[PDB]
């Protein structure tokens, strides 16, 4: 209970980013297992684009919020991509509560906006359900319910939302597309490439489209 939010994971890495100096258009990927696995499976996507991966496998959105100052705000990025809720739904650390998870995402958004960091919100991905645990429909319904709250919040607050789910979830029951996974639960490299095209378009829109003329 000394370091519940796991600030130790990236503490040394954050120190070296400081020693490297100011970076223009830095994008931080804040997330749980999905984000950690992305860096693991395609480090070039992050290195070649100057994106900073700050995913921690297993982490709850509550603990993500608690390390948001250290791993996002203090890195003074231009943009943060928030990928949260997957491990909350997986319940590896405790019972899932949609209201708390959604509230934690909102709190992270508000921390970023107060620090003048642009935000991109994202859909929790589909995954295969083990029948002994829950049905595929139950798994998919929970994910859709949380993603709906995130989308409507994003529309209300003029925040971009990247819907990985609609591109990766297969009929009839929302299983993760077999082309996009090896284990049915996590994306494989092909699945991450689908995600990369989507997120880079949203990042480039934030960094490059300015001065919306209102009439």
């Amino acid at each position, epitope marked *: 209970k000394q370091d519940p939010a796991n600030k130790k994971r990236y503490a040394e890495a954050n120190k070296e980013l400081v020693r490297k100096g100011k970076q223009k258009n830095r994008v931080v990927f804040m997330g749980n297992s999905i984000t950690e696995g992305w860096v693991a499976n395609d480090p070039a996507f992050f290195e070649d684009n100057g994106y900073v991966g700050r995913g921690i496998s297993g982490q709850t959105s509550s603990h993500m919020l608690e390390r948001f100052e250290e791993d996002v705000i203090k890195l003074k990025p231009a943009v943060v991509v928030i990928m949260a809720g997957t491990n909350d739904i997986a319940e590896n650390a405790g019972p*899932y509560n*949609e209201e708390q998870t959604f509230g934690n995402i909102v709190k992270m958004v508000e921390l970023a906006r107060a620090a003048k960091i642009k935000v991109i919100l994202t859909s929790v991905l589909p995954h295969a359900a083990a029948p002994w645990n829950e049905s595929q*429909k*139950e798994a*998919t*319904q*929970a994910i*859709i*319910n949380l*993603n*709906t709250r995130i*989308i*409507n919040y994003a*529309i209300e607050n003029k925040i971009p939302f990247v819907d990985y*789910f*609609v591109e990766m*979830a297969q*009929s*009839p*029951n*929302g299983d993760l597309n077999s082309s996009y996974t090896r284990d049915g639960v996590h994306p494989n490299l092909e699945g991450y490439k689908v995600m990369e095209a989507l997120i880079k378009k949203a990042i480039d829109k934030v960094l490059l489209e300015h001065h919306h003329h209102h009439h």
Partner: antibody
Amino acid sequence: QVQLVESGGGVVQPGRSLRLSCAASGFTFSTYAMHWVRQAPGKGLEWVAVISYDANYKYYADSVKGRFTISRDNSKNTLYLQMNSLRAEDTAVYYCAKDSQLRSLLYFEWLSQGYFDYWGQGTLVTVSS
Amino acid sequence: DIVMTQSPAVSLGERATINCKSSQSVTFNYKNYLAWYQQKPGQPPKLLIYWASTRESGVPDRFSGSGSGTDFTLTISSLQAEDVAVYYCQQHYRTPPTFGQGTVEIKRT
């Protein structure tokens, strides 16, 4: 107040077609899924079809799949039901109804819907020779 | 489909109840996907209660709903002549949404 005003009912010869309209006002129609529900004379309520807020998704009761098409015109705040190849057993009062959920994501057929917070007044469709 | 069934008369001013059962749980992550409607002749159904127990605005406060999982009840605390009607319990946990039907009657001699 929220109002749903239906029109277009009447008599249809078996095998022919009919389009119903439901004109909405008093809420932001374009952000809600919309439903059709029907009631055969003296019987209960049968859900017929849903269309998502953006018209990307349409689903149908098994009893009408292949024959009915739901559509909407968000610029006119109007919902439609095109009924093809009508049968005697389609005789019913047809209701439109508003979904309670804001911008539901109807990515698969079986997903939860909202409750139906507002209903049109009903239009009678009689299928007979 | 999920099947909705009303499994059952009350004097004026007495309490009336309507029971509804669903063929599988319509409770998901602590929300009950069950609504109640009243229908009078020549009129559409009118929402009474949603999320099993939240009374709709403008509905008289003698109407309330309870239950969870597969077993739900509509209670009219003080039965009134204008309350004689068909009532529907709707599940909307799965598509197709489905409706169970039953009627409230004044008991008399």
